[PDB]
Design a protein around this ligand. Structure first.
Ligand SMILES: [Mg+2]
Ligand SMILES: [Mg+2]
Ligand SMILES: [Mg+2]
Ligand SMILES: [Mg+2]
Ligand SMILES: [Mg+2]
Ligand SMILES: [Mg+2]
Ligand SMILES: [Mg+2]
Ligand SMILES: [Mg+2]
Ligand SMILES: [Mg+2]
Ligand SMILES: [Mg+2]
Ligand SMILES: [Mg+2]
Ligand SMILES: [Mg+2]
Ligand SMILES: [Mg+2]
Ligand SMILES: [Mg+2]
Ligand SMILES: [Mg+2]
Ligand SMILES: [Mg+2]
Ligand SMILES: [Mg+2]
Ligand SMILES: [Mg+2]
Ligand SMILES: [Mg+2]
Ligand SMILES: [Mg+2]
Ligand SMILES: [Mg+2]
Ligand SMILES: [Mg+2]
Ligand SMILES: [Mg+2]
Ligand SMILES: [Mg+2]
Ligand SMILES: [Mg+2]
Lengths: 151, 127, 98, 61, 79, 206
RNA sequence: AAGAACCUUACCUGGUCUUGACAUCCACGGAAGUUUUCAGAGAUGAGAAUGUGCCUUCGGGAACCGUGAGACAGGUGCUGCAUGGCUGUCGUCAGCUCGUGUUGUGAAAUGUUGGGUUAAGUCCCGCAACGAGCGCAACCCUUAUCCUUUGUUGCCAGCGGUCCGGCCGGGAACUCAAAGGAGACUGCCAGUGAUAAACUGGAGGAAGGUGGGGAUGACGUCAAGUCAUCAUGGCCCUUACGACCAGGGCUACACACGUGCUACAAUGGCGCAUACAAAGAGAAGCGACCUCGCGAGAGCAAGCGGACCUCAUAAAGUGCGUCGUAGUCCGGAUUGGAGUCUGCAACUCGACUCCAUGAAGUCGGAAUCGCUAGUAAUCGUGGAUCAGAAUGCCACGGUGAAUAC
């Protein structure tokens, strides 16, 4: 907005696992307003990732999200002239949501078998740092530190 | 003894009859687990009788009509929340912090003239 | 036994008609269950407003048909037949049936 | 068919409901008509706003 | 093909079929009724069908069974 | 006008309907037609009596009309002779037995329908609109109105181009549903065309 | 335009009429109406019939029909730049004004500006102004909690007989239905603030800050739209720009644009099983069940002018199996054959069904659109117009987000 402060309530924690981040991930991954399909797909991918990596269930995806989160983002700014890519500081929640969106879109663009396996593959290659989410992730880091004096 | 709670959410009226004993949940003269509980309100119906006490402490008999999956889920949750008068209202102090006592007044907004659903305004050409 | 239904458009006129009916029925006899609310019909209309083009300009109207039901199982007939024909029903629709 | 019974169409084809248009009663408009009040959009509103039609009120549900 | 389970034929047109058959083909008969159905009772006959301004003659054949009288009357005019 | 009609937006608040008859969809349209026809006939014959409003109700299988006027003498005259003919003719047109009643409304200048007609009558007799309308205003307030508003539109004074002129005095809250506003219009047929008159009268807040 | 196959319908071509299709004054004749026949596309002319009744002052009227004269009737003909009425937009933005008073020779100014605050010309303080009006809020409807009355055609907590179905004794607790009330008002506290307005937070509370939504549209602008809804000034036609009928046309088609529906698929398609809703209509109407048909449908045909009966077994959803990434079991246009059904009439030109064929389309350039919470997104149901017609309009519910630094 422009005058009134806003803030959204907190979605319910993810069923059984109780992961608020996982509940937010199903929100982002949701399509056409169908939580059942999103929940089934996320659980299938989560168990596949856990059994493939030999890691636990809760933090197996936490590692990938930690390793695919950025630090600064370029904001199109033009005070006197044309557009300047001015990098800025990323808020905590904004960083988390941006990494989550990156993972979801990276899984979207794949074609391996189906969402259940594509999400697991994205998580694995994000843990390893050889995926496409990470490939897009390093771009902001390389484009940072361009124009500081401007604001 | 018997204890009653109404429960409502999106034109989904429930009826919850809590009582002592160590029985199971019964919704619409039938088991919730038989009625697809693992995804239908998997952990919505059994919210209020988790935080304050254990599930296997009070028998009950629920029956809800009108609404949908989440409609029945929220209606039964609200009814159970307002159906825990086992000992005074000391538990409502804790349930207030969790926010389960208040219902969800949010409802489907009517369809306006000149719009498609409620706020989808038909696109116009040129300006 | 004898069930009576009254229809009108106003909510208080039907209330006073039902009050008159029940008062006369209890005076002349007994066994009155009182009026029953029952659903109320909402006849909804919408009409274009401008005499030419201007499709968006519309007006919404609604008619509230209120309905009341009261039944009596009085044994004696000389009370019900006397109750009939003496009441104007506050000038709204009313029907007699068994 | 059964014999020449169908051919008995010597009627002026006016009694058939298809011939009647069911226009308005005060002025007469082919369009903007409703069965309930028997008038047409425009006229109806005049009566409703002037308070002639019983039980008609603005809808604000 | 469609339209119930039986054909339809006009009566003031059905008055001409019997005369045409009894007296043989004499000349195409000018008419307006674009409703009658080519019934076998017409091989070897010519009929003039109205289109609005002029009555176009048309000769009936053996393979016009499921085709109506007005069918062979082009009302759309093109460059 | 772009303003919602005061006599239509308060029907369920402080403005009783002019028709209080019930009927199913089978004969609703026929009842409407009969009411409109009887009103149109009656208002032409009773033009001199200056009828304010005509209410129609359905007694037990019959038609009952009540007409409120400020000159009951014309419609009543000697005994009920002048109402007997009106009753029989309205019964003829309605197809059912009829009963017509006369109501007296004193202080006619406080009535909207009536104030307008005055104006229109005057205009039709080539009177200066400005003053026709100013008297209306004064008259009313003298009588006690908490407010009055008058408007006239058309080819005022036979001008080549139409113009709208209004006078507002006192308090006329049109957005307050609690208040009762007696609103009415009226037309004139002058040699230059049709002139519209529109009067609001604010009597009380409830 | 909330329903162009006839009509609708004015427009085109043909065939007809001239006091007329319709109102009214006059004369003569004739009950109305019901049945058929000749010609003709029909309108239409041209015959035979049947009928010849109420009031009836016995020279006729009232209901109605045919013929004739003249006043007339008629016009969807022109002018929205003569108009009434009605409507769109700036814009539900907060502004627009009037009394006295004062200032200026005057047009005018003031107030209505300033310091704070608010969604607000909302409120407080100051002030050469003091008051008021239209407008904002508030009165209205709907929705979210509770209470009183009432308890069937609705409901079943405690009990009973229970083909163990709320179905039958009964009861009315409860859902629910509809009448009347309570409640939310910055009200109680803390802090900030010129101590005021107000702001931030907390408690309580179902609902905290005009709670959500609707109705409500100021003075005026656009010679904005409508002479076609209707009315109406002026002009024009009146042996035709009036009236009747058949057919045709409004549905054309080398192109362009607007608004939508269905798709490009695996968050899917198909088969089996199987869940959970609200709001409406119904008498030339809704049309159970049963029988026939692979089908649209047909026969029988109860019930229902309605919490009873019917339309009417909501789809998404979830439980199993198949397809495994392709122009495909995706996709459905086009087209051929065969059918169902409304209607005097489906050919110009209707809807639906069965069999067969299976184009384009694998996310879309410049550019551009809607949406901040039950919102968007997506999934079903109903209603008006209407004999027969929706992807349009109006309206109800299920699932249900992301982001606002
Ligand atoms: Mg539109
Ligand atoms: Mg919806
Ligand atoms: Mg029709
Ligand atoms: Mg006319
Ligand atoms: Mg036509
Ligand atoms: Mg204009
Ligand atoms: Mg001076
Ligand atoms: Mg100002
Ligand atoms: Mg000023
Ligand atoms: Mg200020
Ligand atoms: Mg103010
Ligand atoms: Mg029992
Ligand atoms: Mg609070
Ligand atoms: Mg308001
Ligand atoms: Mg408006
Ligand atoms: Mg113009
Ligand atoms: Mg124009
Ligand atoms: Mg024609
Ligand atoms: Mg067209
Ligand atoms: Mg398929
Ligand atoms: Mg229907
Ligand atoms: Mg109903
Ligand atoms: Mg096929
Ligand atoms: Mg493909
Ligand atoms: Mg239809």
């Amino acid at each position: 907005p422009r005058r009134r402060v806003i803030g959204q309530r907190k979605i319910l924690p993810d069923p059984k696992f109780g992961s608020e981040l996982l509940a937010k991930f199903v929100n982002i991954l949701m399509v056409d307003g169908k939580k059942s399909t999103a929940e089934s797909i996320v659980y299938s991918a989560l168990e596949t990732l856990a059994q493939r990596s030999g890691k636990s269930e809760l933090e197996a995806f936490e590692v990938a999200l930690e390793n695919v989160r950025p630090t600064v983002e370029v904001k199109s700014r033009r005070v006197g002239g044309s557009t300047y890519q001015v990098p800025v500081e990323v808020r905590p929640v904004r960083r988390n949501a941006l990494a989550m969106r990156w993972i979801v879109e990276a899984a979207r663009k794949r074609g391996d078998k189906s969402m259940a396996l594509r999400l697991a593959n994205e998580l694995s290659d994000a843990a390893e740092n050889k995926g496409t989410a990470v490939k897009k992730r390093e771009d902001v880091h390389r484009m940072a530190e361009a124009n500081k004096a401007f604001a | 003894n018997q204890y009653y709670g109404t429960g409502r959410r999106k034109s989904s009226a429930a009826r919850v009859f809590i009582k002592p004993g160590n029985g199971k949940i019964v919704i619409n003269q039938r088991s919730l687990e038989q009625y697809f509980g693992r995804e239908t309100a998997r952990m919505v119906v059994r919210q209020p009788l988790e935080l304050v006490d254990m599930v296997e402490k009070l028998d009950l008999y629920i029956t809800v009509k009108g609404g949908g999956i989440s409609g029945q889920a929220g209606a039964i949750r609200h009814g159970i929340t307002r159906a825990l008068m086992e000992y005074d209202e000391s538990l409502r102090s804790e349930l207030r912090k969790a926010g389960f006592v208040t219902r969800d007044a949010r409802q489907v907004e009517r369809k306006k003239v000149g719009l498609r659903k409620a706020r989808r305004r038909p696109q116009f050409s040129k300006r | 036994r004898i069930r009576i239904r009254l229809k009108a458009f106003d909510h208080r006129l039907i209330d006073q008609a039902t009050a008159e009916i029940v008062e006369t029925a209890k005076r002349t006899g007994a066994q009155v269950r009182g009026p029953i609310p029952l659903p109320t019909r909402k006849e909804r209309f919408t009409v274009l407003i401008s005499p030419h083009v201007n499709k968006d300009a519309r007006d919404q109207y609604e008619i509230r048909t209120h309905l009341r039901l009261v039944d009596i199982v009085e044994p004696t007939e000389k009370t019900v037949d006397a109750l009939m024909r003496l009441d104007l029903a506050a000038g709204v629709d009313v029907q007699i049936s068994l | 068919r059964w014999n020449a019974v169908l051919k008995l169409q010597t009627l002026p084809r006016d009694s058939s409901p298809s011939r009647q248009r069911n226009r308005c009663r005060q002025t007469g408009r082919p369009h903007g008509f409703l069965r309930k009040f028997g008038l047409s959009r425009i006229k109806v509103r005049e009566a409703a706003m002037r308070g002639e039609i019983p039980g008609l009120k603005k809808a604000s549900w | 093909r469609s339209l119930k389970k039986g054909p339809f034929i006009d009566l003031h047109l059905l008055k001409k079929v019997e005369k045409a058959v009894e007296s043989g083909d004499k000349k195409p008969l000018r008419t307006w009724s674009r409703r009658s159905t080519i019934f076998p009772n017409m091989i070897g006959l010519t009929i003039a069908v109205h289109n609005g301004r002029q009555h176009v003659p048309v000769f009936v054949t053996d393979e016009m069974v499921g085709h109506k009288l007005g069918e062979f009357a082009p009302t759309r005019t093109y460059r | 006008g772009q303003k919602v009609h005061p006599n239509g937006i308060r029907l369920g608040i402080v403005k009783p309907w002019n028709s209080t008859w019930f009927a199913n969809t089978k004969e609703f349209a026929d009842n409407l037609d009969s009411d409109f026809k009887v009103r149109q006939y009656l208002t032409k014959e009773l033009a001199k009596a200056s009828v304010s409003r005509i209410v129609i109700e359905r007694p037990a299988k019959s038609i009952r009309v009540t007409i409120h006027t400020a000159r009951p003498g014309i419609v009543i005259g000697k005994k009920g002779e002048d109402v007997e003919k009106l009753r029989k003719v309205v019964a003829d047109i309605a197809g059912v037995p009829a009963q017509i009643n006369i109501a007296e409304v004193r202080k006619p200048e406080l009535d909207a329908k009536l104030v307008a007609d005055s104006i229109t009558s005057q205009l039709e007799r080539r009177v200066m609109f400005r003053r026709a309308m100013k008297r209306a205003v004064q008259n009313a307030m003298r009588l006690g109105a908490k407010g009055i508003k008058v408007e006239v539109s058309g080819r005022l004074g036979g001008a080549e181009i139409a113009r709208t002129e209004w006078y507002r005095e006192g308090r006329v809250p049109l957005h307050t549903l609690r208040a009762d506003i007696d609103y009415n219009t009226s037309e004139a047929h002058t040699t230059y065309g049709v002139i519209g008159v529109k009067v609001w009268i604010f009597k009380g807040e409830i």
